[PDB]
Design a protein around this ligand. Sequence first.
Ligand SMILES: Nc1nc2c(ncn2[C@@H]2O[C@H](COP(=O)(O)OP(=O)(O)O)[C@@H](O)[C@H]2O)c(=O)[nH]1
Ligand SMILES: [Mg+2]
Length: 169
Amino acid sequence: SRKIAILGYRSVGKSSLTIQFVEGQFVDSYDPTIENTFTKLITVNGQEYHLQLVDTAGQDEYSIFPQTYSIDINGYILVYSVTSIKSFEVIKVIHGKLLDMVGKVQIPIMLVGNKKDLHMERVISYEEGKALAESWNAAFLESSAKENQTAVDVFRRIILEAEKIDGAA
Ligand SMILES: Nc1nc2c(ncn2[C@@H]2O[C@H](COP(=O)(O)OP(=O)(O)O)[C@@H](O)[C@H]2O)c(=O)[nH]1
Ligand SMILES: [Mg+2]
C-alpha cells in the first residue's frame, strides 16, 4: 500500500492520465482541473499492489511547506510536459527542496512525461531528464493520456522501480 503524489503544472494533463491510467482506459475525460484522490488495485507477479494517487495544487506547483500536502503517502509521480520548460523545471525544483525537507531515504519516484503527441517538439531532452531521474534513482517515462498503451507501460515500469527503491529504504 503506497500512495503516489501527482505533481503537474496546470492543464498539463494530470486529470487526463489520472483517469486514463487508474482505469487504464482513455475516456472522453474533458472536465476542469479539480483536485482529488484516485486508486488502482492490481496484481503484479501474483503479488497484490494497491496504489493511491493525488492531484492537488494548493499553492505552488505542490507547496513544500504545510498546506494540505501533509498527506501520508509513500510515492511520488511528477508529470513533466514536453512543452513547458515550466512543468519540468518546477518539478525539478519542488523535488530538490522536498527531498531536502524529508531528508529521508529512497522513496518511489516516477518521472512521467505526459502529452506525448507534443513530444513532436520535445523541448526538454530525454537525456537531461534521464540524468535527473537517475539522480534521484527515479524512473523516466514518456506517455500520453490520449494513449493507453503508453500509460500501461508506465504502470509496469513504475511498480518495478517501486520495487527497487523499496529494497533501498
Ligand atoms: N495533447 C495532449 N493533451 C492532453 C493529454 N492529456 C491531457 N491533455 C490536455 O490537458 C488539458 C487540461 O485537462 P487536464 O487533464 O485536467 O489537465 P490538468 O489541468 O493538468 O489536470 C486539455 O487541454 C487536454 O487536451 C495528452 O495526452 N495529450
Ligand atoms: Mg486537474
